[PDB]
Design a protein around this ligand. Structure first.
Ligand SMILES: [Br-]
Ligand SMILES: [Br-]
Ligand SMILES: [Br-]
Ligand SMILES: [Br-]
Length: 244
């Protein structure tokens, strides 16, 4: 997959999948705009990016700072005039507990970060993605969005909302060059261990690098798929099914 001359925006870039996917994108010639909360974490990512032939644009910001997201879109437009790849990876787990035990502040934060800030980002860079000759949006989700695991309610619901926004966006744009898909990255040996599936061996959970390596396929200008869920563990696109 050749991403030479491509511009990618990765949120939650300073750790976990966001970190490793930034690297996989950079390995393939993309220029990464790396968004995260702290400058230090972005600098650590940048050290690794510089070890490749590459260099990144570091954008520390509060993902809930809704005007900062608007400004980022303006910055990208002025400098490059388009955006080729969006990786919406920013997100928090909240706290595992019965739905009625959840703290209000935690519920509101889960929804504001996991849902509203994703929508804000979409609004900000949708025009830029349309200016690409092959815009690609990659929306990070979780298997619990569909398994509806006990005690994971707010998180599960937030990720279901993200997938539905992505599906609607894909339907609205399906005749365009833009393709939008969600991703279930599965559990990794570090990131999201607790999300391992029944029948998935905790001793052989994938490296985050190997997971990021598969996700980068969704950035391919040759990709024809839109509105689907990419299951990394199964290494294939899944179809959504109506209740019946
Ligand atoms: Br972030
Ligand atoms: Br992660
Ligand atoms: Br917890
Ligand atoms: Br539209």
């Amino acid at each position: 997959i050749d991403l030479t001359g491509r511009l990618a925006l990765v949120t939650g870039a300073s750790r976990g999948i966001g970190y490793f996917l930034s690297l996989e994108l950079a390995k393939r010639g993309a220029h990464v705009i790396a968004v995260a909360r702290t400058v230090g974490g972005l600098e650590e990512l940048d050290d690794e990016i510089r070890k490749l032939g590459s260099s990144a644009t570091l954008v520390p910001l509060d993902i809930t700072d809704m005007e900062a997201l608007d400004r980022l879109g303006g910055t990208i437009h002025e400098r490059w005039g388009k955006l080729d790849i969006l990786v919406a990876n920013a997100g928090i787990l909240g706290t595992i507990s019965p739905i009625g035990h959840v703290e209000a502040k935690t519920f509101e934060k889960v929804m504001n970060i996991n849902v509203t800030s994703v929508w804000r980002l979409i609004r900000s860079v949708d025009p830029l993605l349309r200016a690409s000759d092959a815009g690609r949006a990659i929306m990070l989700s979780s298997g619990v969005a569909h398994s509806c695991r006990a005690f994971w309610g707010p998180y599960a619901a937030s990720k279901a909302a993200v997938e539905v926004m992505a599906r609607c966006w894909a339907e609205e744009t399906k005749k365009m060059k833009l393709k939008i898909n969600s991703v279930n990255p599965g559990a990794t040996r570090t990131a999201m261990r607790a999300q391992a599936m029944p029948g998935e061996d905790p001793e052989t959970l994938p490296t985050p690098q190997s997971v990021a390596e598969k996700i980068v396929k969704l950035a391919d200008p040759k990709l024809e798929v839109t509105g689907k869920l990419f299951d990394v563990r199964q290494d294939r696109f899944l179809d959504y099914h109506m209740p019946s």
